[PDB]
Amino acid sequence: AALTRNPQFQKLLEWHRANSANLKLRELFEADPERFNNFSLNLNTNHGHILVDYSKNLVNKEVMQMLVELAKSRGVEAARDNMFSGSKINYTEDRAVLHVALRNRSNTPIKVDGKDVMPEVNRVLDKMKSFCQRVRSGDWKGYTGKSITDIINIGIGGSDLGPLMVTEALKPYSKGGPRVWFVSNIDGTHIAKTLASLSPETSLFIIASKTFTTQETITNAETAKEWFLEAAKDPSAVAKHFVALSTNTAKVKEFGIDPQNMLEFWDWVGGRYSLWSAIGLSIALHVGFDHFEQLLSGAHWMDQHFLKTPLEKNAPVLLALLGIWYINCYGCETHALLPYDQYMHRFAAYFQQGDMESNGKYITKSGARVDHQTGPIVWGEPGTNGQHAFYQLIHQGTKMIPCDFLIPVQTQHPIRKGLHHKILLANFLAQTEALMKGKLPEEARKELQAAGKSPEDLEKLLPHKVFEGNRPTNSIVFTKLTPFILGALIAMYEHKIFVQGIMWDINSFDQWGVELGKQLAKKIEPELEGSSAVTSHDSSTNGLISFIKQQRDTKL
Amino acid sequence: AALTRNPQFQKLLEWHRANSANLKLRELFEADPERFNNFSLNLNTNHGHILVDYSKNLVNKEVMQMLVELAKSRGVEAARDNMFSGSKINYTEDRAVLHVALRNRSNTPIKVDGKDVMPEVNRVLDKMKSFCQRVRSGDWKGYTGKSITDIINIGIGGSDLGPLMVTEALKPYSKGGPRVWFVSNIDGTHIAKTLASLSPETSLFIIASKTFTTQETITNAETAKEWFLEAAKDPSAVAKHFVALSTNTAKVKEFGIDPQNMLEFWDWVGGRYSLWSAIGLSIALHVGFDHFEQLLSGAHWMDQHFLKTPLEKNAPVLLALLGIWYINCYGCETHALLPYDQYMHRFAAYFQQGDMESNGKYITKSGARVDHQTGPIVWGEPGTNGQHAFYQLIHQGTKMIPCDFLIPVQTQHPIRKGLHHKILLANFLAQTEALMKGKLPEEARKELQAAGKSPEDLEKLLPHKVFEGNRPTNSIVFTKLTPFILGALIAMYEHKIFVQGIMWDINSFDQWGVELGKQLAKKIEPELEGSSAVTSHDSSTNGLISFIKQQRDTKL
């Protein structure tokens, strides 16, 4: 594998092995009054600042230098440039990787197969803008001549989680706009309980599918269409209530949606990077196209920062490099995303997909099997709730867990003269301080003495009260969570994932395990029909099928 | 540490060293046609069956024997009995651990300090039942004399996650119940967006807090009261709209709530084991007291299973042991919970707390630091969505991830003559089969041949399309997700967590690891007030505060 053969990597690993045990966050801060100043990036976007404070990490000057050298040696800059210029860097599928084109506000040419993609990107955006105005204004009427009150996105994975996470995060920008619903699971519960709350007269369905063949999405869409036509009784009416977002015109038409009711995107838009495209229509409908444009613009700002900034002060590069340090040198399996923001409640889940589906890989560009770790398990929940759920383990367990803490300085709801947000901010700050500093036995001993504990009780309790600390974090703080800033933040992590992928020499942009998934259920579906015993498979699969057949009729 | 000095553990470790490299799931099944039969438990509860299929695990007869022996030689049977008898096994806080008393439907006496706890458990349940009758009938009137339409639980962590997860899971059972809302984050967004949708005349607030001092909860509660008083004006009208669930009568009265409107619980009820107590009030209000009793009865059934069953066929014990095997022998940091059920969408998050806050520990009963792993990072999202996202990494990444796949045989919504559920089931079955089997080069090559790939294109793409498999799973299948069955499932994992805690020699029932964060936040809170620079901390904390002070009055 390319990474482990790399001399800069070997140097880094050897340094870690010899020196890492001597790195203590508490001592790093004591020894260097300028630590924050030298290990943070204050980015001015001209529409808010984003401070990336990486000073609470197990790094020093030489470590960062070695990490930056590794990024150079692994050709991060050239690979980045190739992505941006429309090179077919998704080599297993022979595709360009051009989510950056979707938000290319500068409109500079980006060519695929000799042709600039910008005119088609902008044409679709213009179409989205027109449609949103017609729907949000109440001009667009349902089959009984009523304005639309509910938008329902039907899609899964990349055709679901982006629009869901972003509409949740930008909820305060949705005043006046129609309600938005997300149906994704094949589990009939999802569509059933959604439809139960809706009228066919005032619901507009958005069928979101790159391929337009995904089993969950097409089945859900057919169920919705059946429900709709049971009420409307007019195939002509489907045009008023169904829109497709896809690359597959033939399958859209096959389903029963006319191409004029289709907004297209392209093969170089990966699902987990698709919210910027036509797939973002439910966002634009919910918050307005203006705010959707601001979202695109923030991503564009961050794209430019990524493209033009020297590696040593490049925000997504530094986040990627810190990740490499913890993954390939320390061996940390996971990375936690902990936004101190209720609107961001699905942010961690979004990048759980974006990161893991991208970098959960084991074959390189050369076809080699990796002999090192690739992508981490990404997880998290919003603060402060996590403090009362799993922070016990972060503080006092046996796992090293790099954490990104994120918060906006300004809240969307400054209730009680800002009291709630002051408390929220205090916790955000305290938790990373606590993770860094810990509490020494002698410090814990003094507290227990002042608590009036007898010598016997104190000695039994003491070790349980000790916090070993030295637990590293990033703190990412931004002026306010506006559409623009959110766009910038999502793009930042997209580029983090890119840099890690290039360094590991893997393809961040295919998903053969997801493709495998879509082939699997067809072989079992037919066996579930009828009362016949299944002996076809391994005994577990067989035994589970037998249990299912036995139990499906019993009346509880 | 007790575990590492245990000779049965050393034997297990050495077996793993010698034999685990050649342990292959495919081969285990091919060699043993009785595998499913001898590595699964079909539990008949008399109210549905629960099948715990652990056959797709990297274990054989000898491994399971060694694991059972380890449980025995670590004192699991005696420790369990001590829990059930009211022994003060929460040794750092000197408390009993008696969530099993809460759901003790048999009413067998359980003594703490010589007194049976059951009379008081039952008195509170009777009062809970009375509250439910009054609210659900419409007999409970708000300050203008109108029936309650909305219930709002205010609480965090143990006082939030349980009621939230269970009301979500049992949503079909909520016909005729009030709408239920959960406010938990201190983030003002949470209460603000909730209160915007409510009328003070028809809203009942439930302040859920064991201590009745938690900052987030008491602050949210006071904000709710302030909002109410703006409308109702009369401080005596508060008494019709506020109910408390707590152990602290004194603090409840101080807040202004009459004991008439209080439901009590006890110190031996851990927050993360509290949904079975008064804390479950919002569940019982939403789905009715009879369904809440069924939930308790299901847990009770599982309690009896755990108490009476020989270890080698004891469901929570076997789940615990498989976890010990993967954590302490294979070194797997994480454990994924993957319910193929939309109603169970908060199940993984619930046990993220239940597991991680219990077993994220590093000090043993002796006071020694563990020199082995304890609790795993728990995570997951419902199927089938995960198949389109992080399953990419489960299938093709560099991490070993034990997964529990869960599904009901019967769906709550058998739409399209069961079509959706058939597809869901087929995916559930096919994914664990594929995780075990993978896809061989000879299988992948035929697909590339059929696609018309050139010998050279085929050769380059081939390794990307091969799946190594050998990824172990549990399949947990149950007749239907009824209140009873849900109760049994939750209790099962509660007892799994208990067993692992005993084996690690840790206290599953305290949570000292949250203290430091709370201490440091109280110091920072007042520092945020005013324009003056803060220098009392490390430079990162100081610098973040400076950025917050600079950015909070920036107008975007």
Ligand SMILES: O=C[C@H](O)[C@H](O)COP(=O)(O)O
């Ligand atoms: O990579 C995940 C995909 O986004 C998901 O399978 C949906 O695919 P689709 O957009 O083609 O329906």
Ligand SMILES: O=C[C@H](O)[C@H](O)COP(=O)(O)O
């Ligand atoms: O373990 C977490 C606790 O349940 C949480 O902090 C809430 O505590 P409380 O019920 O005392 O408010």
